[PDB]
A paper describes a structure:
In crystallization trials, we obtained for Td-BPH a hexagonal crystal form diffracting to about 2.7 Å and an orthorhombic one diffracting to 2.3 Å. The higher-resolution orthorhombic crystal form could subsequently be solved in space group P212121 via molecular replacement, locating a single tetradecameric double ring in the ASU. The tetradecameric complexes from both crystal forms are virtually identical, and most of the sequence is resolved in all chains from Thr1 until Pro-190. However, in both crystal forms, the center portion of the pore loop (between Gln-95 and Glu-101) is disordered. In summary, both BPH proteins unequivocally form double rings with 7-fold symmetry in solution. Prominent residues in Td-BPH are Thr-1, Asp-17, and Lys-37, with Thr-1 acting as catalytic nucleophile. Lys-37 corresponds to Lys-33 in the proteasome; its function is to facilitate deprotonation of Thr-1 (28). Asp-17 assists in this reaction by orienting Lys-37 and making it prone to protonation. Equally present are e.g. conserved Gly-50, which helps to provide the oxyanion hole that stabilizes the transition state, and Ser-139, which forms hydrogen bonds with Thr-1. The S1 pocket, determining substrate specificity, is of hydrophobic character, priming it for the accommodation of uncharged amino acids.
The second hitherto unknown bacterial proteasome family member was primarily found in Betaproteobacteria, hence its name BPH, short for Betaproteobacterial proteasome homologue. In this study, we present the first experimental characterization of two bacterial BPH proteins. Their crystal structures reveal homo-oligomeric double-barrel complexes with internalized active sites akin to those of proteasome and HslV. Unique structural features, however, like an elongated inner pore loop with a highly acidic sequence, distinguish BPH from its relatives. Confirming an initial hypothesis, our cluster analysis shows that BPH branches off from HslV and appears to be its direct descendant.
Numbering used by the authors:
A (entry chain A), B (entry chain G), C (entry chain F), D (entry chain E), E (entry chain B), G (entry chain I), ...: 1 to 95, 101 to 190
F (entry chain J): 1 to 95, 101 to 191
H (entry chain K): 1 to 95, 101 to 192
Amino acid sequence: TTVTIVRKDGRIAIAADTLTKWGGGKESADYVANHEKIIRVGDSYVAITGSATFKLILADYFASLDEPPQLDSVARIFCVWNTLHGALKEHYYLQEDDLESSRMDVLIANPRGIFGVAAHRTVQEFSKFYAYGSGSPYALGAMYAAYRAPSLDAEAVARLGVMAAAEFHDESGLPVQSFVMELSP
Amino acid sequence: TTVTIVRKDGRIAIAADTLTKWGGGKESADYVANHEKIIRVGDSYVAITGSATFKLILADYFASLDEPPQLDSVARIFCVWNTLHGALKEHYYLQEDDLESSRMDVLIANPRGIFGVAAHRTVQEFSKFYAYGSGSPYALGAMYAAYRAPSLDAEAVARLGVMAAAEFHDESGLPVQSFVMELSP
Amino acid sequence: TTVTIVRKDGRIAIAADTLTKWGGGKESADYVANHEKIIRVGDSYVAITGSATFKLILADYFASLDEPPQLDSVARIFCVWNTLHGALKEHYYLQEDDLESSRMDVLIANPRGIFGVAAHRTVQEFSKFYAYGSGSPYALGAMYAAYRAPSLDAEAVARLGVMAAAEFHDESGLPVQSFVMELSP
Amino acid sequence: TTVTIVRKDGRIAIAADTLTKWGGGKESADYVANHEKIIRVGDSYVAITGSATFKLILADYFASLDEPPQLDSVARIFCVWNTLHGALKEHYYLQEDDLESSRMDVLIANPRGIFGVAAHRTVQEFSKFYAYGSGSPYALGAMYAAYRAPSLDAEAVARLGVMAAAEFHDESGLPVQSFVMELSP
Amino acid sequence: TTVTIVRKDGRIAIAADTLTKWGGGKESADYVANHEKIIRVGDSYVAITGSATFKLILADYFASLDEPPQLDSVARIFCVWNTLHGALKEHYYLQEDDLESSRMDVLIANPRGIFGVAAHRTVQEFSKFYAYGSGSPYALGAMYAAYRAPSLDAEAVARLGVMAAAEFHDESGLPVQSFVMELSP
Amino acid sequence: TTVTIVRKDGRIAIAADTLTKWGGGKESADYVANHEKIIRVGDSYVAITGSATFKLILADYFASLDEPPQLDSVARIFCVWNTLHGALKEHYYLQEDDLESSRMDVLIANPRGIFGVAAHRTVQEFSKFYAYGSGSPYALGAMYAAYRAPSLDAEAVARLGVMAAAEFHDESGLPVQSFVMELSPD
Amino acid sequence: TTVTIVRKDGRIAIAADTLTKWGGGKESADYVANHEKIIRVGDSYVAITGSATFKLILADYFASLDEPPQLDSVARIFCVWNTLHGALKEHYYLQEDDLESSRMDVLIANPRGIFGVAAHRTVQEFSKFYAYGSGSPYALGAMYAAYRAPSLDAEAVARLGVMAAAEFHDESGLPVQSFVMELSP
Amino acid sequence: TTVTIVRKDGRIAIAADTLTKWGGGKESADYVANHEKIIRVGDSYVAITGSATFKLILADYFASLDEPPQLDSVARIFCVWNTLHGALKEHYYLQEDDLESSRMDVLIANPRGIFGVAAHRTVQEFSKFYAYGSGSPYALGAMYAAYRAPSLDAEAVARLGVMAAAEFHDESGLPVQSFVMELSPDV
Amino acid sequence: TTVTIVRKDGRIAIAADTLTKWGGGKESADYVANHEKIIRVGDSYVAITGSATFKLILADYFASLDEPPQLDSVARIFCVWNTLHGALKEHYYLQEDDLESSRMDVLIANPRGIFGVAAHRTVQEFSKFYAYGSGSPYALGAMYAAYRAPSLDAEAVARLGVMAAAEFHDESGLPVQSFVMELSP
Amino acid sequence: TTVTIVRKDGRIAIAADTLTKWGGGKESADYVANHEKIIRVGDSYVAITGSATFKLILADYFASLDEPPQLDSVARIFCVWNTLHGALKEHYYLQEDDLESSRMDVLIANPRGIFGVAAHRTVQEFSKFYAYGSGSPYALGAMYAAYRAPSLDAEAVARLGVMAAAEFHDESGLPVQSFVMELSP
Amino acid sequence: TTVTIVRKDGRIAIAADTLTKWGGGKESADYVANHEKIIRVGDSYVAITGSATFKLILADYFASLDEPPQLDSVARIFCVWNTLHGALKEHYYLQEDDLESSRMDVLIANPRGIFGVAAHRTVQEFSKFYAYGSGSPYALGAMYAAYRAPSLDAEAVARLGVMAAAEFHDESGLPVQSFVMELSP
């Protein structure tokens, strides 16, 4: 998996590759209908790495809440993820470290910022771009190279990061899925 | 075990081999009468890999419910399987990974699509064909070869996948059980 | 232990060796008065492999029930054995795999058919013959060779499989106990 | 420890050595006054192997029951020992296998038959003789040789078994302790 | 991580580097908005090492109390941290040693002293300076060498320790955050 | 793999299955041309179990000796195999137990008797029948039931042994190969 | 890696993928110039699996020999590979099992037939087709499905085997290379 | 395996069961023609426990010697077994303890006495009887009971030892093989 | 470490970072005079990853050889490295895998092309660009995104590769060292 | 520690060394005031081995009982010790074998007999003498030799046993403490 | 095994038990004719613990030397044993610690003194008595108690040592073998 997220010229963009793995087996977007790794939660886009089951768990979990959660500040995202964690263990059968791992790394894009939440509930707000998943290093290199290119908007930089992972790494694959939105004032 | 599933030209088919193993020993359809690995649940056909007990657990479990479940969307199937897993542990004595394993992979065929659930509750809708079990690589290769052949409908492609596995792998054996049905409007 | 079961010409038959092992030590029928490995439950004969305590546990357990179970279908036998596993744990101090093990393989004969239940509660109806225990490989070989000899009825076949095991394996011993009954049409 | 039990010519006999061990330490009857490894439980004698504490546990446990248990059939003894195992865990601090081990093998004599219970509650009725404890192979050897000698009665045979073990094995020691009773009609 | 704390000439200062790590990967203040490792708690500054999630947990935890805690004495800080540790386990999913580790080392600067709390709740009041995190040995050496330079106030000595750590260790990176305040009478 | 050997009424027969395994993968005589597990060594037939490479090693080893070895007495077969084991180690890259394993269980049929050499160089002469390889229990069961049937000669019994194994075990498969010969006047 | 070999209608064909792996890193023919996995040895084609270093080793070794080897019978191939194994260990730094592993599986095409040599020096002549490498189960299934299709010649079958593998497994990737030759009379 | 050795009334006897094991598989004398576990070496009989290969190894070894070994004192037997052990490692592919195991226990009967050599080359002369193999304890107990029965000679006692083991232990089986000889008049 | 190599518009460029690591300690070019990771070998530039000792070893090795090696084809490079490995073991104290590891990955630039040798003597000629060392994922990412930009020659791209690694990974550090040359006809 | 108990000529005696160990450190009676290893319980003396804390525990435990326990028969002692073991775990933080170990061996002298209780609650009545602690072998040796000497009474023998252990074993040290009493009629 | 050595009133004695052990099995001097554990070497007697094989080894070794060794100084005995240890490994197949172990402890009595050599070739001369083997503790204690007795010579004392260990420990057994000699001037 590679997920990327970008902030540039008052535009916020998020992207994901589409390949699932089952061991060394490839399950591409060509063979799986529900191959999207980005789900909608309220007005946030949430890009998920880790087991392919997590996008089904989160969609189900968030949908089961009274209202969709606020994912627009670090404190709020953390607060939601910490509560999400107890549900993973208690309801969705989640299984050395400082803290217990939630086993997934997510990126969160919405009008009010670009964020990440690492497996250990390390919430971060990003200023330019970041990437998660095993393809992250490839994405970061490529986005670093093309971030300041005037010809590329946020979305094109996001997608380019996923493309670089997909070129070099066996856990990412084309096509790329992406979304783009305007930064709120 | 090999189970395959296929969707082609308005037809949905599902196929399983019929060989059960006890260690290195072979328990073929010629010696076991109840050698079918596909069960009926409502209007769905569920093909089951993993221990030969699971088809008895699932048959028992589903026959226990008030109404047959809904197995025609990813969201629905996921919910049914996430409830099934709790029952597996509690009432059926099921025994590292991100999430707990249900220790079986199933394929689901009905008039409203073809689906799969891996052991870790990864629910997937398939667009063409797929296969589970130790034999599935073989099945995948054979169905890739044959999917587009004009003389072969969905059922014949699914049956060929199991044959392929049964030819080269020691956990699959003939005869092949298959079912076919029309895709609904 | 070797236990066998055969269905031929409208006659069901079941058979077992009589030898108990205590480590390398041999505790034969000549020294042990309760050397029988087949018990009666309702109108079924149940031949039991594993620890020699299991025949005592099952007789005790099935006698404690309001009435004997029906062991005449795959579905029914599975219900019975899944409940029995619960009891083995809770009342009889029973102690990796997909499902928890019951530590015993059994064959079941009654007029309505010949069945088996493996340690992981894999219930199976057999069409010709089968065998359980460390001796079964020997028994199946012998019975495969002898099943179609006109001379030999169901009981003679069952018995011969146990003899073969006793000839060549150190956990099986003569004499052979066997029971025969007519196939309920 | 060696204990034997023999039935011959209308006589039943039970015997035990008298040596206790504490590591490589010897604690003979010369130094220990309570060196009896056989106890009385109603009209039954129970010869006990394993930890030297079990004779105390059993005596104390059986004394606490409203009445002495009937120990004169395989089924009855099994009931008793199954309930006993619970108490060993629950009251007397008892600590791989099919079933949990009670950590002792016993022989039981009474006027109605000879029996043994192994650590995993394998209750057995014997036709001639048997032995338990680390000295049993020596004892069985000896009693096999002596059993048919007309000049040796049941008790002579049972004692000779214990003698043989004490001759050759470092966990068995003289004097031999034996009891005899009449076979009921 | 490096955190330093300094007391000199009626002035109290606290510093931290800004670099976060994810494996061998660097997440600098350049890419992470919330790169601050120091938080406010009443009129104390708390500089936190260990998992980057802890600043989120602590901020969240202290915020949830009725009033901010008094963190101006060795006795009071301990009491607070002890209670905090319970919460870490009970609410924030905190997972050999003398006592349970809290998995973080902190420094506390307020107007009424400079303190630290190691991971096993060893509370200490410092009289000159100290440093925590993987970069402290570097910090202590640099601060040792510069404590008594008249040109350098408390905050210059605090920042310099961090700089030294950033120069030589792969878990510390510039910029240096810092705060200064007056000693209370 | 299953190999059977049988001695009955002045006839000697030897039989083997034909299936080779690569993990769980099957490699039947339908796909492999050289699927035979029995080789000829002089006027002996030698049925081999263990790695499919051993029949290549053995053919190669024996062909390289001045003449084909005498394999018609326990003592002679032993000397041959003890010397063979040194060559497995030195020339063909063979890798708890009392003795070193040769990693291979063989049956040897010839006009002068039926023999077997187990992996630990246990040389036996059999008087009726025997089987080696993972399928052998099935083979022993079957041949036990059939050995005394008048209608089945040494070869029929041997083949039936292999059939039984192939019927029930995942490392044996049809077709059966077999050879039969006359017992020498000894 | 996937390599295939096929014999059909008087023609022999051999085929390989071109992708090299470095952990999860992909090194496709698009970045690597020397991406061929098939080499010429005399008038044979040899398709190589295992470490990408093996093709260089064999090229080097065979080029060093006085005459190109004859790879046209099982016995011949066997002598050649047995001697090769000695050179792997001795000059090329080659590093549980019955026999030492040579760590690579090869397929050999020449006009006298199609052959294979597994890691353990298992020389096999094939009659129809075969495949090696981690991709081979898929290739086997594909080639099984297509082998008797009259519209596909030996080359088309061999290539399809590799394409099947590259569709579904992460250690195989296009382009496919192939070679075809005449069977000799 | 069970091997027994007995010295009684001026007579020396030695016995053995005839069953081989391959795992939990039985290879009885009914199916194996060379089921004997006792070999002649000069005028000694050597009964061998452990892997069935050892009887083949030992016959080969002793046949290759210039002259049969004299196996009629403790010091002579030790010397032979110590040399043998070096040959077991060097020529016959033998594989924690004080000393290296030879992996077999043997009993040696000859006119000049009855002896045993355990796996660690512990050579013993026996005064009455003894047994080796997994079936020894059963054989010992049985011979303990029957040694002084007046109707039984040394051979009957040695054989009885084997039969007790076969009765109760899965690694020993009938028939029993045995040999008997005269105690020489110089001992 | 990061080493990159680029082939573009008739020019060949090779580049490396300058940071040495001693555990978590940083030894930057600022503090180390011999911080260069590229050395000459003939007219070839060879960039070296793995232990900082290796450049001293190869310098010493090649300086003692007869005539410099010709590192201008795969076969030749392989020949040279295979023999090098024998010397690393024998004279320079080198210490699962198919082949023994040489423990360093190198890139090789000369006018006749660009090449790489991985730890297991896997010689590849590259057609566009590549990277080795723990930073290479970042570098490959970056260089993928910049390779086709007309404003950036071979050297600019190679350099950008290293910059990317150093931005995000703790084992790579600025400044970048690089060399460019002409492709020979 | 060594503790001994002796019965001779109508007298009972009991003794113990006075040395405590802290690792290889010695804590003699000369430095430790409460160096007694024997306590009073009713009219019984109880000599205690194992951890030096046990005598405090037992003294604390027995004092808290409504009245003193009767320690003058095997059945009664066991009863007492079995209850005690419960308290050790629950109240005094006591932590493979048949039964749980109470981690201490004791000897009990009273007017009505000599007894012991080993760690696993083996209660014994002795007829002459016995010893416990790491020094017991030495003490049983000395007392064996000196028992029948008319110049030594029960106390001299008991004291000589401890002296023998102090002579030769590094966990026993002089002085000896001893008590004597009259055998009751 | 117990061996003892004693020097008292111008006489020197040495003793040993006669029991051999094979596991838990006893081989008493009633069953083994060569049950002696003391051998002659010149005018020394040497008592041997460890495997029963060692007395055969030492006998064979010392008989093979040109002359019996001098064993009447610590310097001389050490020389002899150091050389002996080499012969043990080289000719007699002897198999963590400071020094290699010879795996036996011996006592050596001659007219010029009494000595011992421990497993690690610690040679000692004793002034009164000593003991080796697993029974030595019991023997030392007994000899400490008896050494001064006016009616017991050195031989009586030596034998009493052994007797005490045969009494209490499962690896020593009666009869005792002893020799005696006059201290030489």
